[PDB]
Amino acid sequence: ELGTDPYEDFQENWNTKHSSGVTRELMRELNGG
Amino acid sequence: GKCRGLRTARKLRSHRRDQKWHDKQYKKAHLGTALKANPFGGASHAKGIVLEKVGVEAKQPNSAIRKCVRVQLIKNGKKITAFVPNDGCLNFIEENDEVLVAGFGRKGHAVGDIPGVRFKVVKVANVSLLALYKGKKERPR
Amino acid sequence: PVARSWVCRKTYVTPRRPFEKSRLDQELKLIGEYGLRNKREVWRVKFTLAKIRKAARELLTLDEKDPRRLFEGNALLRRLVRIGVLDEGKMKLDYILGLKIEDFLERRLQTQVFKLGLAKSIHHARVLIRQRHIRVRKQVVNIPSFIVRLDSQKHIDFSLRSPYGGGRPGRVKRKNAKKG
Amino acid sequence: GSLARAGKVRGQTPKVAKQEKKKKKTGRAKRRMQYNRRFVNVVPTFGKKKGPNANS
RNA sequence: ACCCACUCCCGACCCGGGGAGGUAGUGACGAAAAAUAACAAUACAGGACUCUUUCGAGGCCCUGUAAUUGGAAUGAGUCCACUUUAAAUCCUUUAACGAGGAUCCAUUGGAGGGCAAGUCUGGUGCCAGCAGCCGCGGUAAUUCCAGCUCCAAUAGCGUAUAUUAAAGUUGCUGCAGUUAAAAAGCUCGUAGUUGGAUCU
Ligand SMILES: [Mg+2]
Ligand SMILES: [Mg+2]
Ligand SMILES: [Mg+2]
Ligand SMILES: [Mg+2]
Ligand SMILES: [Mg+2]
Ligand SMILES: [Mg+2]
Ligand SMILES: [Mg+2]
Ligand SMILES: [Mg+2]
Ligand SMILES: [Mg+2]
Ligand SMILES: [Mg+2]
Ligand SMILES: [Mg+2]
Ligand SMILES: [Mg+2]
Ligand SMILES: [Mg+2]
Ligand SMILES: [Mg+2]
Ligand SMILES: [Mg+2]
Ligand SMILES: [Mg+2]
Ligand SMILES: [Mg+2]
Ligand SMILES: [Mg+2]
Ligand SMILES: [Mg+2]
Ligand SMILES: [Mg+2]
Ligand SMILES: [Mg+2]
Ligand SMILES: [Mg+2]
Ligand SMILES: [Mg+2]
Ligand SMILES: [Mg+2]
């Protein structure tokens, strides 16, 4: 099952309260670390 | 520009010595007015007697009532507003008690929403607030 | 005034950045591979290697014919060859900079007990050493961080008093035999 | 302001007792478990790296 | 608290004295080493390996996880003795006892970013509170109070204060002065600083 999309989360919450989280998630999706 | 002569050591040293006084922290540490005005007198901690309990309104945009205590130090007799940091710890302090007070963490500068408060309570009635909060020790009574 | 000595020093340095992912992964890999107790044991060997490198770099700034360089670099290379980190053919002062921490980690008694077949695991090797089952050519050693010299490599064995090296059976065997 | 609401929330949270868990290993054994869990035992992944405490 | 046994000092002295000094007691100032488990069989899961094109196949090997089994190894303690010492204590050496929940139970701070680690569940509802800073909390709180889980160091870990690096934010190395802080309204001038070539 495909539950969470980091790209959508960042693009939607980049200016919200949960920005610092989603950015931190997006890097994990990109750099593999 | 600066002088680069071979015999200009006195000029350079004198200029640096005189221009060090325009540094805020060097002047604060070497002038003596701050040490005289410091209620602790340079100590890390102090002991005082709780004069009363007060509530300080948190600065905007935050809205809350920070519980504090007015105390009077034993060595010099100065009056100080100290913060009691925890959920419900103000019920561990009674009036006319003896408390240990330390700094707030910013070297005499106010921290957070609390205006003009730079001290916090550590131990009350010779027992630590952490032990009372975690229920490890009881009030002596 | 007293007749005591106050000479002492620390054997490790803490890293500047407390939470660095790459450093944590590397240190945990080292701990897992060599069965170390904590991060401090890695930092101790790192400090030792740093001191050796600092001495070698300080001796490389002198002239080749300087008497102090010739005297002290020779001693440093001799000690490195003695402990086994260096080789006889690589006894130049530049090769010291080519040393790594794994070379010093390979010379501990804990890893040498495991590599010689006395133990079936590195943790088992540490347990055997700490429980007084291993002797070094005459002497019972129970310090895992013991650094084995080259000439002592052939002389690691079970202690004569150990149940493994021909000694009396242990507590559990005696109790079980008493049971039956 | 009024000081009568001190300890309001901490005195309202319903009490929950901690459960019983097997004791954790310490020292070298804890590091051995961490080393075997993070590096020795790894499952194939498709690039979506998950944290140790990810949930939902 | 014990002793002049060591180191030395004084005296008419090889003999006397010494809270000088030495030895014990308190002692997480601080420094060094280093336990809190190891192994085997099962029960599952991955890899390599082969044969089978695929369903597949295996003690055929290697590696991981079990309050599933099993018997081995131990010092923390209790404690003869010797040794240690002026007499002791401690350490070392050794008899006997001494581990399966091996209950002989490791803690200190965090889980939005800085900075390693959960927008999981239940409460509260700009209150209580957290927060070094940015900030969170006004009925779906990733930040408060709790449970679970997860991080970091580890017999150690938080807090307050002085101080060093970070600070090329005191700049000798090595900072700036048009507009971000900044060159005297202008000129003269003593001390100070600096000073053109040329001699084998
Ligand atoms: Mg100011
Ligand atoms: Mg607010
Ligand atoms: Mg004497
Ligand atoms: Mg005498
Ligand atoms: Mg004395
Ligand atoms: Mg004395
Ligand atoms: Mg220490
Ligand atoms: Mg224990
Ligand atoms: Mg915790
Ligand atoms: Mg929480
Ligand atoms: Mg953070
Ligand atoms: Mg992170
Ligand atoms: Mg603000
Ligand atoms: Mg809610
Ligand atoms: Mg919630
Ligand atoms: Mg500084
Ligand atoms: Mg610098
Ligand atoms: Mg400054
Ligand atoms: Mg430079
Ligand atoms: Mg500047
Ligand atoms: Mg200006
Ligand atoms: Mg002008
Ligand atoms: Mg002049
Ligand atoms: Mg000239």
mmCIF file of all heavy atoms in Angstrom, chain C residues 38-39 44 121 126 131 133 145 168 170-171 176, chain E residues 33-35 39 72-73 75 95-96 153 155:
data_model
loop_
_atom_site.group_PDB
_atom_site.id
_atom_site.type_symbol
_atom_site.label_atom_id
_atom_site.label_comp_id
_atom_site.label_asym_id
_atom_site.label_seq_id
_atom_site.Cartn_x
_atom_site.Cartn_y
_atom_site.Cartn_z
ATOM 1 N N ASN C 38 32.019 0.372 24.418
ATOM 2 C CA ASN C 38 31.366 1.664 24.240
ATOM 3 C C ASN C 38 32.158 2.499 23.242
ATOM 4 O O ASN C 38 33.141 2.040 22.655
ATOM 5 C CB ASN C 38 31.215 2.388 25.580
ATOM 6 C CG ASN C 38 32.487 2.369 26.401
ATOM 7 O OD1 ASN C 38 33.571 2.112 25.880
ATOM 8 N ND2 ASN C 38 32.361 2.640 27.692
ATOM 9 N N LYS C 39 31.710 3.743 23.055
ATOM 10 C CA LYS C 39 32.355 4.642 22.101
ATOM 11 C C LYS C 39 33.713 5.112 22.606
ATOM 12 O O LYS C 39 34.590 5.460 21.808
ATOM 13 C CB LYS C 39 31.451 5.844 21.819
ATOM 14 C CG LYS C 39 30.197 5.519 21.030
ATOM 15 C CD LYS C 39 30.532 5.129 19.606
ATOM 16 C CE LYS C 39 29.276 4.901 18.786
ATOM 17 N NZ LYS C 39 28.498 6.153 18.600
ATOM 18 N N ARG C 44 39.752 6.292 22.363
ATOM 19 C CA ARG C 44 41.086 6.101 22.929
ATOM 20 C C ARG C 44 42.100 5.729 21.852
ATOM 21 O O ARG C 44 43.190 6.314 21.779
ATOM 22 C CB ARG C 44 41.033 5.030 24.016
ATOM 23 C CG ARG C 44 42.379 4.635 24.577
ATOM 24 C CD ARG C 44 42.208 3.654 25.718
ATOM 25 N NE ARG C 44 41.521 2.437 25.298
ATOM 26 C CZ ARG C 44 41.058 1.516 26.138
ATOM 27 N NH1 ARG C 44 41.203 1.679 27.444
ATOM 28 N NH2 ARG C 44 40.447 0.436 25.673
ATOM 29 N N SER C 121 33.957 -16.681 19.012
ATOM 30 C CA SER C 121 33.373 -15.373 18.748
ATOM 31 C C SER C 121 34.249 -14.313 19.394
ATOM 32 O O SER C 121 35.030 -14.599 20.304
ATOM 33 C CB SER C 121 31.936 -15.277 19.271
ATOM 34 O OG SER C 121 31.085 -16.190 18.603
ATOM 35 N N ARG C 126 36.277 -12.046 24.454
ATOM 36 C CA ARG C 126 36.326 -11.093 25.557
ATOM 37 C C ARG C 126 35.892 -11.747 26.864
ATOM 38 O O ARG C 126 36.491 -11.514 27.920
ATOM 39 C CB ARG C 126 35.454 -9.879 25.245
ATOM 40 C CG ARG C 126 35.434 -8.842 26.351
ATOM 41 C CD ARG C 126 35.394 -7.438 25.785
ATOM 42 N NE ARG C 126 35.542 -6.429 26.827
ATOM 43 C CZ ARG C 126 35.761 -5.140 26.590
ATOM 44 N NH1 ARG C 126 35.864 -4.703 25.344
ATOM 45 N NH2 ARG C 126 35.882 -4.289 27.598
ATOM 46 N N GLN C 131 37.495 -13.770 32.226
ATOM 47 C CA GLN C 131 37.244 -14.789 33.235
ATOM 48 C C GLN C 131 38.482 -15.623 33.550
ATOM 49 O O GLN C 131 38.355 -16.725 34.094
ATOM 50 C CB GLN C 131 36.092 -15.692 32.795
ATOM 51 C CG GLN C 131 34.752 -14.978 32.734
ATOM 52 C CD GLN C 131 33.626 -15.888 32.294
ATOM 53 O OE1 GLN C 131 33.837 -17.072 32.036
ATOM 54 N NE2 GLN C 131 32.422 -15.338 32.205
ATOM 55 N N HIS C 133 40.966 -17.225 31.695
ATOM 56 C CA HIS C 133 41.194 -18.465 30.966
ATOM 57 C C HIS C 133 42.361 -18.374 30.000
ATOM 58 O O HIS C 133 42.728 -19.388 29.398
ATOM 59 C CB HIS C 133 39.941 -18.872 30.186
ATOM 60 C CG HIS C 133 38.827 -19.371 31.049
ATOM 61 N ND1 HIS C 133 38.951 -20.482 31.853
ATOM 62 C CD2 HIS C 133 37.564 -18.919 31.223
ATOM 63 C CE1 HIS C 133 37.814 -20.688 32.494
ATOM 64 N NE2 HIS C 133 36.955 -19.753 32.129
ATOM 65 N N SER C 145 42.072 -5.088 26.407
ATOM 66 C CA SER C 145 42.801 -4.088 25.638
ATOM 67 C C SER C 145 44.301 -4.336 25.610
ATOM 68 O O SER C 145 45.046 -3.483 25.119
ATOM 69 C CB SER C 145 42.527 -2.690 26.194
ATOM 70 O OG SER C 145 42.847 -2.624 27.573
ATOM 71 N N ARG C 168 41.323 -28.269 36.902
ATOM 72 C CA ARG C 168 40.233 -28.871 37.645
ATOM 73 C C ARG C 168 38.884 -28.392 37.103
ATOM 74 O O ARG C 168 38.759 -27.249 36.657
ATOM 75 C CB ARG C 168 40.380 -28.514 39.122
ATOM 76 C CG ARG C 168 39.147 -28.651 39.991
ATOM 77 C CD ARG C 168 39.307 -27.789 41.231
ATOM 78 N NE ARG C 168 38.348 -28.113 42.281
ATOM 79 C CZ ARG C 168 38.277 -27.467 43.441
ATOM 80 N NH1 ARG C 168 39.106 -26.464 43.691
ATOM 81 N NH2 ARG C 168 37.379 -27.824 44.348
ATOM 82 N N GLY C 170 35.114 -26.901 36.884
ATOM 83 C CA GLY C 170 34.573 -25.717 37.512
ATOM 84 C C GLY C 170 33.465 -26.019 38.504
ATOM 85 O O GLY C 170 33.171 -27.166 38.843
ATOM 86 N N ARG C 171 32.844 -24.939 38.979
ATOM 87 C CA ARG C 171 31.817 -25.042 40.013
ATOM 88 C C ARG C 171 30.605 -25.826 39.521
ATOM 89 O O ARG C 171 30.085 -26.699 40.227
ATOM 90 C CB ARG C 171 31.405 -23.640 40.458
ATOM 91 C CG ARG C 171 30.344 -23.598 41.538
ATOM 92 C CD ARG C 171 29.550 -22.303 41.463
ATOM 93 N NE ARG C 171 30.410 -21.141 41.259
ATOM 94 C CZ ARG C 171 29.967 -19.894 41.148
ATOM 95 N NH1 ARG C 171 28.669 -19.640 41.228
ATOM 96 N NH2 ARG C 171 30.820 -18.898 40.961
ATOM 97 N N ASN C 176 26.930 -30.464 39.515
ATOM 98 C CA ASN C 176 26.119 -31.415 38.760
ATOM 99 C C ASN C 176 26.567 -32.851 39.005
ATOM 100 O O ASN C 176 25.733 -33.760 39.085
ATOM 101 C CB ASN C 176 26.168 -31.080 37.269
ATOM 102 C CG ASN C 176 25.524 -29.745 36.951
ATOM 103 O OD1 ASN C 176 24.781 -29.193 37.764
ATOM 104 N ND2 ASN C 176 25.800 -29.223 35.763
ATOM 105 P P A E 33 41.686 3.681 30.323
ATOM 106 O OP1 A E 33 42.080 3.530 28.902
ATOM 107 O OP2 A E 33 40.438 4.407 30.665
ATOM 108 O "O5'" A E 33 41.608 2.225 30.963
ATOM 109 C "C5'" A E 33 42.660 1.288 30.777
ATOM 110 C "C4'" A E 33 42.511 0.100 31.692
ATOM 111 O "O4'" A E 33 42.449 0.550 33.066
ATOM 112 C "C3'" A E 33 41.247 -0.727 31.513
ATOM 113 O "O3'" A E 33 41.355 -1.666 30.457
ATOM 114 C "C2'" A E 33 41.073 -1.377 32.878
ATOM 115 O "O2'" A E 33 41.922 -2.505 33.007
ATOM 116 C "C1'" A E 33 41.588 -0.284 33.810
ATOM 117 N N9 A E 33 40.504 0.541 34.374
ATOM 118 C C8 A E 33 40.198 1.840 34.066
ATOM 119 N N7 A E 33 39.186 2.319 34.745
ATOM 120 C C5 A E 33 38.806 1.265 35.560
ATOM 121 C C6 A E 33 37.791 1.130 36.520
ATOM 122 N N6 A E 33 36.937 2.105 36.835
ATOM 123 N N1 A E 33 37.681 -0.055 37.155
ATOM 124 C C2 A E 33 38.537 -1.032 36.838
ATOM 125 N N3 A E 33 39.531 -1.027 35.956
ATOM 126 C C4 A E 33 39.612 0.165 35.344
ATOM 127 P P A E 34 40.091 -1.986 29.520
ATOM 128 O OP1 A E 34 40.476 -3.072 28.589
ATOM 129 O OP2 A E 34 39.573 -0.706 28.983
ATOM 130 O "O5'" A E 34 39.009 -2.583 30.520
ATOM 131 C "C5'" A E 34 39.182 -3.862 31.109
ATOM 132 C "C4'" A E 34 38.169 -4.102 32.196
ATOM 133 O "O4'" A E 34 38.250 -3.036 33.174
ATOM 134 C "C3'" A E 34 36.714 -4.095 31.753
ATOM 135 O "O3'" A E 34 36.301 -5.342 31.222
ATOM 136 C "C2'" A E 34 35.975 -3.697 33.025
ATOM 137 O "O2'" A E 34 35.831 -4.812 33.889
ATOM 138 C "C1'" A E 34 36.964 -2.722 33.661
ATOM 139 N N9 A E 34 36.672 -1.318 33.321
ATOM 140 C C8 A E 34 37.258 -0.562 32.341
ATOM 141 N N7 A E 34 36.801 0.663 32.275
ATOM 142 C C5 A E 34 35.849 0.718 33.282
ATOM 143 C C6 A E 34 35.003 1.746 33.729
ATOM 144 N N6 A E 34 34.976 2.968 33.196
ATOM 145 N N1 A E 34 34.174 1.472 34.757
ATOM 146 C C2 A E 34 34.200 0.246 35.292
ATOM 147 N N3 A E 34 34.949 -0.801 34.960
ATOM 148 C C4 A E 34 35.762 -0.495 33.936
ATOM 149 P P A E 35 34.824 -5.527 30.621
ATOM 150 O OP1 A E 35 34.868 -6.650 29.651
ATOM 151 O OP2 A E 35 34.334 -4.199 30.180
ATOM 152 O "O5'" A E 35 33.954 -5.991 31.872
ATOM 153 C "C5'" A E 35 32.610 -6.416 31.711
ATOM 154 C "C4'" A E 35 32.142 -7.233 32.890
ATOM 155 O "O4'" A E 35 32.295 -6.465 34.113
ATOM 156 C "C3'" A E 35 30.676 -7.632 32.884
ATOM 157 O "O3'" A E 35 30.415 -8.771 32.082
ATOM 158 C "C2'" A E 35 30.387 -7.853 34.362
ATOM 159 O "O2'" A E 35 30.884 -9.113 34.786
ATOM 160 C "C1'" A E 35 31.239 -6.758 35.002
ATOM 161 N N9 A E 35 30.469 -5.521 35.230
ATOM 162 C C8 A E 35 30.790 -4.260 34.800
ATOM 163 N N7 A E 35 29.922 -3.344 35.147
ATOM 164 C C5 A E 35 28.964 -4.048 35.857
ATOM 165 C C6 A E 35 27.778 -3.645 36.492
ATOM 166 N N6 A E 35 27.343 -2.385 36.514
ATOM 167 N N1 A E 35 27.045 -4.589 37.114
ATOM 168 C C2 A E 35 27.483 -5.853 37.094
ATOM 169 N N3 A E 35 28.578 -6.354 36.531
ATOM 170 C C4 A E 35 29.288 -5.390 35.921
ATOM 171 P P C E 39 28.061 -16.149 21.631
ATOM 172 O OP1 C E 39 28.805 -15.896 20.373
ATOM 173 O OP2 C E 39 26.700 -15.587 21.803
ATOM 174 O "O5'" C E 39 27.979 -17.726 21.842
ATOM 175 C "C5'" C E 39 29.139 -18.535 21.725
ATOM 176 C "C4'" C E 39 28.885 -19.953 22.175
ATOM 177 O "O4'" C E 39 28.386 -19.970 23.535
ATOM 178 C "C3'" C E 39 27.842 -20.731 21.395
ATOM 179 O "O3'" C E 39 28.344 -21.239 20.172
ATOM 180 C "C2'" C E 39 27.436 -21.822 22.378
ATOM 181 O "O2'" C E 39 28.382 -22.879 22.375
ATOM 182 C "C1'" C E 39 27.540 -21.087 23.718
ATOM 183 N N1 C E 39 26.226 -20.631 24.231
ATOM 184 C C2 C E 39 25.363 -21.569 24.811
ATOM 185 O O2 C E 39 25.725 -22.753 24.865
ATOM 186 N N3 C E 39 24.163 -21.169 25.292
ATOM 187 C C4 C E 39 23.819 -19.882 25.214
ATOM 188 N N4 C E 39 22.629 -19.522 25.697
ATOM 189 C C5 C E 39 24.678 -18.906 24.634
ATOM 190 C C6 C E 39 25.861 -19.319 24.162
ATOM 191 P P A E 72 27.341 -30.404 32.500
ATOM 192 O OP1 A E 72 27.709 -31.831 32.331
ATOM 193 O OP2 A E 72 26.898 -29.911 33.826
ATOM 194 O "O5'" A E 72 28.586 -29.522 32.046
ATOM 195 C "C5'" A E 72 28.953 -28.353 32.764
ATOM 196 C "C4'" A E 72 29.670 -27.371 31.873
ATOM 197 O "O4'" A E 72 28.712 -26.679 31.036
ATOM 198 C "C3'" A E 72 30.421 -26.252 32.571
ATOM 199 O "O3'" A E 72 31.694 -26.663 33.037
ATOM 200 C "C2'" A E 72 30.497 -25.176 31.494
ATOM 201 O "O2'" A E 72 31.556 -25.447 30.589
ATOM 202 C "C1'" A E 72 29.174 -25.376 30.757
ATOM 203 N N9 A E 72 28.145 -24.395 31.142
ATOM 204 C C8 A E 72 26.946 -24.604 31.773
ATOM 205 N N7 A E 72 26.247 -23.509 31.953
ATOM 206 C C5 A E 72 27.037 -22.515 31.396
ATOM 207 C C6 A E 72 26.867 -21.126 31.263
ATOM 208 N N6 A E 72 25.796 -20.461 31.697
ATOM 209 N N1 A E 72 27.853 -20.430 30.658
ATOM 210 C C2 A E 72 28.931 -21.090 30.220
ATOM 211 N N3 A E 72 29.202 -22.388 30.284
ATOM 212 C C4 A E 72 28.204 -23.049 30.892
ATOM 213 P P A E 73 32.385 -25.927 34.286
ATOM 214 O OP1 A E 73 33.719 -26.542 34.494
ATOM 215 O OP2 A E 73 31.416 -25.887 35.405
ATOM 216 O "O5'" A E 73 32.614 -24.436 33.779
ATOM 217 C "C5'" A E 73 33.574 -24.144 32.775
ATOM 218 C "C4'" A E 73 33.738 -22.657 32.600
ATOM 219 O "O4'" A E 73 32.553 -22.096 31.984
ATOM 220 C "C3'" A E 73 33.895 -21.871 33.888
ATOM 221 O "O3'" A E 73 35.222 -21.906 34.377
ATOM 222 C "C2'" A E 73 33.415 -20.480 33.499
ATOM 223 O "O2'" A E 73 34.435 -19.773 32.809
ATOM 224 C "C1'" A E 73 32.302 -20.808 32.503
ATOM 225 N N9 A E 73 30.957 -20.806 33.113
ATOM 226 C C8 A E 73 30.291 -21.857 33.689
ATOM 227 N N7 A E 73 29.093 -21.553 34.127
ATOM 228 C C5 A E 73 28.958 -20.210 33.813
ATOM 229 C C6 A E 73 27.913 -19.292 34.014
ATOM 230 N N6 A E 73 26.756 -19.599 34.605
ATOM 231 N N1 A E 73 28.095 -18.029 33.581
ATOM 232 C C2 A E 73 29.253 -17.717 32.988
ATOM 233 N N3 A E 73 30.306 -18.490 32.743
ATOM 234 C C4 A E 73 30.095 -19.739 33.186
ATOM 235 P P G E 75 36.057 -16.424 39.495
ATOM 236 O OP1 G E 75 37.382 -17.033 39.220
ATOM 237 O OP2 G E 75 35.087 -17.149 40.350
ATOM 238 O "O5'" G E 75 36.304 -14.982 40.111
ATOM 239 C "C5'" G E 75 36.676 -13.906 39.260
ATOM 240 C "C4'" G E 75 35.584 -12.871 39.144
ATOM 241 O "O4'" G E 75 34.309 -13.518 38.858
ATOM 242 C "C3'" G E 75 35.356 -12.020 40.392
ATOM 243 O "O3'" G E 75 34.995 -10.702 39.988
ATOM 244 C "C2'" G E 75 34.151 -12.695 41.036
ATOM 245 O "O2'" G E 75 33.406 -11.871 41.905
ATOM 246 C "C1'" G E 75 33.350 -13.094 39.807
ATOM 247 N N9 G E 75 32.371 -14.161 40.036
ATOM 248 C C8 G E 75 32.591 -15.505 40.198
ATOM 249 N N7 G E 75 31.494 -16.187 40.389
ATOM 250 C C5 G E 75 30.487 -15.234 40.356
ATOM 251 C C6 G E 75 29.083 -15.368 40.507
ATOM 252 O O6 G E 75 28.422 -16.393 40.706
ATOM 253 N N1 G E 75 28.438 -14.142 40.405
ATOM 254 C C2 G E 75 29.060 -12.940 40.186
ATOM 255 N N2 G E 75 28.262 -11.865 40.115
ATOM 256 N N3 G E 75 30.366 -12.803 40.041
ATOM 257 C C4 G E 75 31.012 -13.981 40.137
ATOM 258 P P A E 95 42.198 -23.628 45.473
ATOM 259 O OP1 A E 95 42.987 -24.588 44.662
ATOM 260 O OP2 A E 95 41.488 -22.510 44.804
ATOM 261 O "O5'" A E 95 41.129 -24.451 46.314
ATOM 262 C "C5'" A E 95 40.326 -23.798 47.282
ATOM 263 C "C4'" A E 95 40.309 -24.543 48.593
ATOM 264 O "O4'" A E 95 40.806 -23.674 49.644
ATOM 265 C "C3'" A E 95 38.932 -24.976 49.072
ATOM 266 O "O3'" A E 95 38.529 -26.215 48.513
ATOM 267 C "C2'" A E 95 39.092 -25.015 50.585
ATOM 268 O "O2'" A E 95 39.733 -26.214 50.991
ATOM 269 C "C1'" A E 95 40.050 -23.851 50.821
ATOM 270 N N9 A E 95 39.355 -22.579 51.102
ATOM 271 C C8 A E 95 39.692 -21.367 50.560
ATOM 272 N N7 A E 95 38.943 -20.372 50.956
ATOM 273 C C5 A E 95 38.049 -20.965 51.831
ATOM 274 C C6 A E 95 36.991 -20.432 52.585
ATOM 275 N N6 A E 95 36.652 -19.141 52.575
ATOM 276 N N1 A E 95 36.282 -21.279 53.357
ATOM 277 C C2 A E 95 36.625 -22.572 53.365
ATOM 278 N N3 A E 95 37.599 -23.190 52.700
ATOM 279 C C4 A E 95 38.290 -22.324 51.939
ATOM 280 P P A E 96 37.332 -26.276 47.443
ATOM 281 O OP1 A E 96 37.295 -27.649 46.882
ATOM 282 O OP2 A E 96 37.453 -25.116 46.525
ATOM 283 O "O5'" A E 96 36.023 -26.071 48.323
ATOM 284 C "C5'" A E 96 35.681 -26.992 49.347
ATOM 285 C "C4'" A E 96 34.611 -26.431 50.246
ATOM 286 O "O4'" A E 96 35.177 -25.393 51.088
ATOM 287 C "C3'" A E 96 33.454 -25.743 49.539
ATOM 288 O "O3'" A E 96 32.475 -26.648 49.062
ATOM 289 C "C2'" A E 96 32.939 -24.781 50.599
ATOM 290 O "O2'" A E 96 32.162 -25.471 51.564
ATOM 291 C "C1'" A E 96 34.243 -24.348 51.261
ATOM 292 N N9 A E 96 34.801 -23.131 50.649
ATOM 293 C C8 A E 96 35.929 -23.037 49.878
ATOM 294 N N7 A E 96 36.193 -21.821 49.471
ATOM 295 C C5 A E 96 35.168 -21.064 50.014
ATOM 296 C C6 A E 96 34.874 -19.692 49.951
ATOM 297 N N6 A E 96 35.620 -18.808 49.286
ATOM 298 N N1 A E 96 33.777 -19.255 50.604
ATOM 299 C C2 A E 96 33.032 -20.145 51.270
ATOM 300 N N3 A E 96 33.205 -21.457 51.403
ATOM 301 C C4 A E 96 34.303 -21.856 50.744
ATOM 302 P P A E 153 26.551 7.334 21.317
ATOM 303 O OP1 A E 153 27.630 7.426 20.304
ATOM 304 O OP2 A E 153 25.650 6.156 21.320
ATOM 305 O "O5'" A E 153 27.213 7.459 22.758
ATOM 306 C "C5'" A E 153 28.033 8.570 23.082
ATOM 307 C "C4'" A E 153 27.962 8.905 24.550
ATOM 308 O "O4'" A E 153 26.611 9.295 24.903
ATOM 309 C "C3'" A E 153 28.274 7.771 25.512
ATOM 310 O "O3'" A E 153 29.662 7.546 25.677
ATOM 311 C "C2'" A E 153 27.575 8.222 26.787
ATOM 312 O "O2'" A E 153 28.343 9.211 27.454
ATOM 313 C "C1'" A E 153 26.323 8.887 26.224
ATOM 314 N N9 A E 153 25.165 7.974 26.199
ATOM 315 C C8 A E 153 24.688 7.247 25.143
ATOM 316 N N7 A E 153 23.629 6.530 25.423
ATOM 317 C C5 A E 153 23.394 6.801 26.761
ATOM 318 C C6 A E 153 22.415 6.346 27.660
ATOM 319 N N6 A E 153 21.447 5.489 27.331
ATOM 320 N N1 A E 153 22.463 6.808 28.924
ATOM 321 C C2 A E 153 23.433 7.667 29.256
ATOM 322 N N3 A E 153 24.407 8.166 28.503
ATOM 323 C C4 A E 153 24.332 7.687 27.252
ATOM 324 P P A E 155 30.946 2.853 31.027
ATOM 325 O OP1 A E 155 32.221 2.937 30.276
ATOM 326 O OP2 A E 155 29.958 1.810 30.664
ATOM 327 O "O5'" A E 155 31.299 2.692 32.572
ATOM 328 C "C5'" A E 155 30.270 2.547 33.544
ATOM 329 C "C4'" A E 155 30.013 3.829 34.300
ATOM 330 O "O4'" A E 155 28.615 3.869 34.692
ATOM 331 C "C3'" A E 155 30.815 4.002 35.587
ATOM 332 O "O3'" A E 155 31.002 5.395 35.843
ATOM 333 C "C2'" A E 155 29.856 3.452 36.634
ATOM 334 O "O2'" A E 155 30.100 3.903 37.949
ATOM 335 C "C1'" A E 155 28.521 3.964 36.101
ATOM 336 N N9 A E 155 27.351 3.199 36.535
ATOM 337 C C8 A E 155 27.225 1.844 36.695
ATOM 338 N N7 A E 155 26.034 1.471 37.097
ATOM 339 C C5 A E 155 25.330 2.661 37.204
ATOM 340 C C6 A E 155 24.009 2.951 37.583
ATOM 341 N N6 A E 155 23.121 2.022 37.941
ATOM 342 N N1 A E 155 23.623 4.244 37.584
ATOM 343 C C2 A E 155 24.513 5.177 37.227
ATOM 344 N N3 A E 155 25.780 5.029 36.850
ATOM 345 C C4 A E 155 26.129 3.732 36.861
#
